[PDB]
Design a protein around this ligand. Structure first.
Ligand SMILES: O=C(O)CCC(=O)C(=O)O
Ligand SMILES: O=C(O)CCC(=O)C(=O)O
Lengths: 211, 207
């Protein structure tokens, strides 16, 4: 909760911004002039290669601070591509307002420090996921992250609340569409997960951890 | 600048291989790595290890403590000989509440670690093991590189096993790929240190 209440107040109030699914929040090349708080939805940070291929660096969940490059002072240019993965609501602030707002309303550098601490650890989770030698573990590991980040209770289990193309999954776990199609499909038959409308449900993740 | 030094100081020596913290430890402290390299690892009891982060100089770590306690789940080790400052949370939380101008540097410090961890994702993201190696080697050149006529010398005693545990591979493959890299006149291993000639050329391998 806390982060919302910090950002909002940052003399006139801060308006929430809407972003349609697929709309860019920032392009590689833009000046890194801003910090953001993702309020609702999912934002995908991606690295684009001159080769054409993209890699997902982070699928960020709600109440996440991002754009964090702007805090490094000296400005700089974005090198990642920030996109609304789902429909997105966020606050953005120019860097300077954050410097002062933190200084003055003192309690809340602690909220930003916790916000940023949260992000470091989450990324380190993603590394652990990407390091598994066998791709199936990666998938399961990734799916489990998506359950606690985007999971919504169903009668039939926990349901990752995202339109996830297999291609999307491919670009996050460092694989290809064909492999993930086969792995998923083999978790479907194993009665370990279920898929409808591009959304995945993992039964008893507690269990999926144990196998 | 760095100036994180200048905040923290208001030093501990650690021997190559000594533990800074183990899983099971309480998460009661924050650290600033002043000199050397610290390796955060995840131990898959039972048996093997995976490197989550090789941290370079002037890095804040132990960051779990800032989440308000908990227990460490990673293993913090002096990869080289290490100099660091450590502070209990309470002194640090208090300090930041009493003197709330020292937060900007911490915010930049933590931002940097996010950006650096994201690099390691770019690396492990590659499907091709050779690209991972090159990607990883290049990071090590920025982070631990010394200058050198034709390129850059990673200033670490790096076992191939170490490299294996960072890039998600095995010792046999690293030793092999380094060979192919070497035999292409792209790196050298002299007095136990990897030197990568003309990295910028090689960094165009990606983009
Ligand atoms: O992880 C983030 O917050 C995005 C990184 C960033 O700010 C950039 O690439 O400019
Ligand atoms: O990345 C770090 O700072 C170390 C993570 C940590 O503090 C822990 O595992 O307890």
């Amino acid at each position: 909760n806390s982060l919302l209440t910090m950002f909002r107040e940052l003399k006139l109030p801060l308006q929430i911004e809407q972003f349609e699914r697929g709309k860019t929040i920032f392009f590689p090349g833009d000046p890194a002039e801003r910090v953001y708080l993702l309020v609702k939805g999912a934002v995908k940070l991606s690295r684009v290669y001159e080769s054409g291929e993209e890699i997902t660096v982070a699928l960020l969940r709600e109440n996440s601070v991002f754009g964090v490059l702007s805090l490094l002072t000296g400005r700089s240019d974005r090198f990642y591509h920030a996109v609304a993965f789902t429909p997105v609501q966020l606050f953005s602030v120019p860097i300077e307002f954050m410097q002062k707002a933190l200084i003055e309303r003192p309690e809340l550098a602690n909220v930003m420090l916790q916000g940023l601490s949260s992000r470091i650890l989450q990324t380190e989770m993603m590394i652990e996921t990407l390091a598994h030698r066998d791709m199936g573990s990666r998938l399961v590991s990734f799916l489990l992250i998506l359950c606690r980040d985007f999971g919504i209770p169903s009668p039939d289990g926990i349901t990752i609340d995202l339109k996830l193309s297999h291609q999307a999954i491919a670009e996050a776990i460092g694989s290809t569409r064909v492999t993930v199609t086969r792995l998923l499909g083999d978790l479907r038959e194993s009665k370990l997960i279920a898929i409808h409308k591009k959304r995945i449900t993992v039964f008893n993740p507690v269990a999926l951890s144990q196998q």
